[PDB]
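Hi both,

Apologies for the delay on this - the queue was longer than expected. I finally got the magnesium ion-bound model through. Below you'll find the protein sequence and the ligand SMILES exactly as submitted, and right after that the structure tokens for the full complex including the ligand.
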Amino acid sequence: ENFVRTNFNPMILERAEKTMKEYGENPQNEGNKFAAISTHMEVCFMYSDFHFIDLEGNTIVKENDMLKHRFEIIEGQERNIAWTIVNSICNMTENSKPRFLPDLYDYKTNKFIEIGVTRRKVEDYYYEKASKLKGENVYIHIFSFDGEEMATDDEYILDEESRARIKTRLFVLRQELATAGLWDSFRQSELEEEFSYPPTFQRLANQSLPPSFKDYHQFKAYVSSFKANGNIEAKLGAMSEKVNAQIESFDPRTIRELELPEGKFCTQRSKFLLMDAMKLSVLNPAHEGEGIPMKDAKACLDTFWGWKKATIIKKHEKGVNTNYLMIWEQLLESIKEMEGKFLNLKKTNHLKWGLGEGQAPEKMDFEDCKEVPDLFQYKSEPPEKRKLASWIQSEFNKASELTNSNWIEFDELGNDVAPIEHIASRRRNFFTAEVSQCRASEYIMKAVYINTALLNSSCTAMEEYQVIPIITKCRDTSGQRRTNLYGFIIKGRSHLRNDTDVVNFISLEFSLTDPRNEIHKWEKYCVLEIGDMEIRTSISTIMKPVYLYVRTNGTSKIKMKWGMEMRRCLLQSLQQVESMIEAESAVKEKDMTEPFFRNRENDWPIGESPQGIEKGTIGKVCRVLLAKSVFNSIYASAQLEGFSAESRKLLLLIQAFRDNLDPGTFDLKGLYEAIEECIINDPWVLLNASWFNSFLKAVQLSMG
Amino acid sequence: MDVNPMLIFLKVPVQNAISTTFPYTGDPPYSHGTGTGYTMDTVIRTHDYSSRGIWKTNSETGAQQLNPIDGPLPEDNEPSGYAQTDCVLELIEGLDRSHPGLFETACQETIDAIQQTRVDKLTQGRQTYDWTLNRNQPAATALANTIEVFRKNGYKLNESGRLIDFLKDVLLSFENDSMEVTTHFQKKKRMITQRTIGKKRVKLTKKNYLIRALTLNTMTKDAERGKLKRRAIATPGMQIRGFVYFVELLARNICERLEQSGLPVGGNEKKAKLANVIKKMMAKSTDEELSYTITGDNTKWNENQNPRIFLAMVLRITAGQPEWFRDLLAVAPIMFSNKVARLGRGYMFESKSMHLRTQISAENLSDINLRYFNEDTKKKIEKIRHLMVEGTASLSPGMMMGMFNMLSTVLGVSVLNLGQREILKRTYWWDGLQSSDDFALIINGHFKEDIQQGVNHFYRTCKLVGINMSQKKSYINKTGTFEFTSFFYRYGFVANFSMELPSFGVAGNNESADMSIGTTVIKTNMINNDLGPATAQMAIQLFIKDYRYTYRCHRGDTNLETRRTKSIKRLWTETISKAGLLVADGGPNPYNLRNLHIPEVCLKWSLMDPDYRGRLCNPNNPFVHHMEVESTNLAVVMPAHGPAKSLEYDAVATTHSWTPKRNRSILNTNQRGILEDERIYQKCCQVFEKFFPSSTYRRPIGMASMLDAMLSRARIDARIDLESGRISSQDFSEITNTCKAIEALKRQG
Amino acid sequence: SGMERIKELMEMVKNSRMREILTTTSVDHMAVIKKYTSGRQEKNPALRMKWMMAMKYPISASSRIREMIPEKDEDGNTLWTNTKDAGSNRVLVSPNAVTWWNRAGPVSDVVHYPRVYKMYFDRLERLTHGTFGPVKFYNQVKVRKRVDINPGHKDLTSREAQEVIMEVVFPNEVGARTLSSDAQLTITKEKKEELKNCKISPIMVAYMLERELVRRTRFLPIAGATSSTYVEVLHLTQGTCWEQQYTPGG
RNA sequence: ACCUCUGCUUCUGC
RNA sequence: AGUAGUAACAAGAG
Ligand SMILES: [Mg+2]
Ligand SMILES: [Mg+2]
């Protein structure tokens, strides 16, 4: 290998090293192909060099270069750039592409040249190259170490001095190969994947076996020669009979109910008031700056005149309750004094308390605080259990009722052309007439508005205490626009990094409900009595006190992102009702939408009175499934996720009994434990567990 | 009347209203803080189900390793990891006997795919643990960091470009006693002060590098539905991804031809397979033959399958193949048998009297006073301290990262294959479908005690091979109804629309892509998930509203006020044909049921003003960012269940095909030099694509450097444009002199 | 014209780090460092888009926008900024920049768009001239069966389609891949005639050609005809309980 | 305390 | 305080 590194020129060494590295073999190992490729590249470069094309088109054998070359070298390059060279040449002229890669290209004759440097007879290798490379205009030009040549059709385009230098250099290299004693092995030499383990990985492989094996190759020989002879049956006879999947017969008449937890009553945890909310309205708003939320808030605020000096009538027991009073007074004073489209509050002390400014501990390093006597890790206690209270059922009752306003305004659609689009338009209009005046649609509008405004304010004003009015816009039955104000939200600082990062806000919501009639519902609220208004009724007209429910609440980026998308509750309700319509339409072989929505018979069980199971119409089913999806979105929790996933199996087992499909379990007690593990303190999960118990009692009465 | 929606199931069957049991309109549960406790819980549980195994100290890493294979048989119905090797080999032998030629053809296809795979196939992946940085990186930059550290340390077989030479370099790098990596630290000096970050070359030991190469980075699974408590997941490093690739390629070629395998098929194909197995198991041999179906779940699936069993499976499937191929496929269970788990970010400590908080790492958990912790964490750390090896926990049993999904499917399909009538010759037989964790099992017999004996036979055979059927979550009934991966079969598959409800809404790519994705999602759910026509119309309306509010592109005649109102209003007033404006430009919605399959630019093309159409479809626009043909019109969607999918949409590239800005937190960290490295890499790839325009379409191959290839291309393009009238002779001479100057600069430095 | 790129190449090789990268990175390894990023793939793009569209400058555009559009519009909205996107040379722009381009940017010629995006315009041509019949309600018997979803493909595999696209879009860089079939020669001649002087990006042209010339299949539940022009409108014709009678155009 | 930077980036796998 | 729930946020970094 030292002869090839000594006699040949280093550019030929570089070309041969690139060729062998591209082909995987090595000059240090296989050196016969190394010296053969080096001699081939030497002959090809002596063919190519010192041949130029002038500014007329004649070969002037010069030694200095402003004339372009006559030959272009395609041998020795990488294969992809060589095929790029060949393809650009053939697209420059008009010639068809050859099947193999040649060695040179002559721009004078416009021809691809092929050169093979052999260690045997010139004629045999030339006839081999001719029989192989047949079917294309390739000028084969075979040389050898004998100082002779063979060409295609006896057309010799290379000049006499270049061929004389080629033959002289080949004879000199043959004499230097023969005097050095390295010449016969050239005439003697004229899917193989390997993957073994190096020793550290071999010792790693020896320690990753079953325990009766010490060598990895011993284990390979065992696995390759394994024949089964009843190993499974022998270990099945040897296994204890306490490993079994015994089937317990499932019968809903004998199963127990879910055990709902004990403790204090569950409290309200929604981000705004639901059945207890009170709105100040402006009918057909047309004030200056209408559309801007603070302008609508001042316009709806001017409709109320019965303000007083606000007093605390229900205290938040863990809070500084006079701070909430000062917050409402500062907010009202700043609304009366504002001159713009937005409102940022001063960072007073009571507002800083209510928004939790400075409540994060100072972030330090561990060695700087190692010796603190009460440096403890964070409290990771389970949630405290709560009892089911009566208010969440009445909230769900009011959420599925009809109001007097349309709350959903849908965007425009493309025009109906197909008949199925007209069928879909009639069915969608039936569902919209059954669902747009529902109170859960009003809750959708409140939540989408609040979460949209809170997310935009949290992104754009991270250091500001922005005031966000709680505004919906509805239409009456006469079609008149109405703007409703429910109260205000004061945002805190909102440097929201993680998706679970909390922005604290203060909710201040109008109400007519006295909180002392149901105080366990309001354990997070400080309720102020802010005024009096005249409610006019059928008996007389009475001055009711107007209350303000003030609360510190918090939301995250992911929570208000999901609150922004609460209109998909409509899709869930409409999809279920439409699948129920289409199931009857496939049977009756006609469209069943108008018989469903028009025939006002009570034929769907949707409730219970003391007189038994109550039935309703399909529009009641629409509003009830809508309110269920809305309350799933409002009271979303991991408890609800676990409860729904685990109680679905009990529902499917009851359905399997009612289909006479003979249901059976393997561990019903573990299933009941997995259901009851998820019922902790969330009022909606407690109501859903009570609902499962009521459905189970109704099934047990329907059977027996 | 107190309203109860569950009473709807008194009239409607539960499967026909099953969407009222999926509360998927609210936010999913998320974890806060670390996942160190979930990771330590996983390691403690994995060692508890295998505790009657044999402990051995590893000679190469020092890790305490538990071996439950061929251990004592289980004595109760608790989850156990005592899989028997001979039972596994008997089941794989039965799977080979029932499918003759399957293993040999899968092995031959894997052999043919090994010789054609390049290293850049490892760029396709999510967050890979980077042993160079001891953190998570994207898969391509983790691969680039590994290749760079390997080339700096003398491992350069991967310069051939194929994957198997990179794998040879990975295995040969374990012989290094001093692998040299580069870290980072800040240097602040100075009357105004400037500060930058300088590199520092560290040298790992042999044990340090071997522990880093076998490290899984653990974190918490977020946004998972159906559970009360969070679980931990793991991502592996770059040293094992290439071996896991070939093992999963073999197991995918096996699972594609098993009709009892639920992998790797979509929803409709899995429903077709379940319908076929229900039709086969209800053809009835006699007339009084019983048929029962187990709606099954497997408890602690990943914590009880063992890498040594997977090693035996790989060596038995490949029986009769070349030994290099057997060793190469055996590397990945061997490296999973010696794996260690990184224990997360640690914990936060709080001082209430001094009002401070601090973050201790998981490396500090081995040497810290136990008085800081609560009782659960204190018990976890005391149980975990004997498994500790250099900041990581030793985790020999179990499959924590869970990458052998198709191999676990092969193991479950072998137990399903055992229950043929011609193999068992019993009074019972079984069949079903296996999709990794989930399984359906139809058991047929003549009496109910035959059904119980078949259930016990299946359950004990699964216990012999480390498969633990969940008795709390499984139930049995007569064949006609079951559930499989939230697919509810009640004499036919029913619709479960609530599973697809998070996919409705704005996808979050750009305006054009999200319009295409939203209409395609509505169309796909109309075809597959039985979305009705009225609900599809309302879904179009709700998507258009969420799209207008998300991108602030309300209609030009409306009276809202955003940052984009005045500009869209100017475009609205200057437009003659308003119906040709896109929704992103303040135009009307064109979509109904019949045209959801038509992109919005084509649907409005004949209605556009020609000037607006020329501005909107201008190819010389600075907003669009074409990178690669294979990534064109691709989004990554994350469904409510399952891993993230690649979704193809149909969209004309306009000025609404822009890209959002990147996260900028790296500028405050030590890794801000990665930005400069990425910028230089993008500039080099841009000038290479100036020389080689097909590189954006077909990946160019070559062992020569980029500069040499560009110089050769410049030389041939000059000679081809000189002899064609395109380029003069002085420009040719200037190009050749510039190439010679570039060669001189290359030879200089 | 290929003289500016070699000047840019010499200016890059004059820098030491770019020279070290271009001399150490092979052509095959450049597919690895092409995808080098600090930016990770977004795991919640819906929430991230809702959070970013509230920002002032959430869009990254090419820096030449600073010469293309003004810094402010007629309303005084800042359209672009000088701050760079992370790990890139792109600057941070406003959505008002996109609206300004759509109402007042350079008008280009769009006669190549119905030829490049012909697969998309064929769907609208089939829908516009389609005939709707009556809706029939009955139990639909759908069969989950693998059909094809590419109305108007050419019977070419991925290798043959790759050869045709390489002969049409990038004709000098095909390598050792000659067009074996005469149908491929017909598609190549027709597409080189149609897609001539095309200023649409070659990435989009190669993408649309690959979407056109390759037969693609899906697993769908079909109740009636399984032809690819009927699978194209499968959401429109069949339902769970209804069938819409429809014949497409052509 | 002023000022600068950041808002998925020490933490989202198959 | 509040969000929340098995660990965090209640700004982080310089
Ligand atoms: Mg709460
Ligand atoms: Mg299951």
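Main takeaway for now: The radius of gyration of chain A is 44 Å.

I'll put the files on the shared drive as well.

H.
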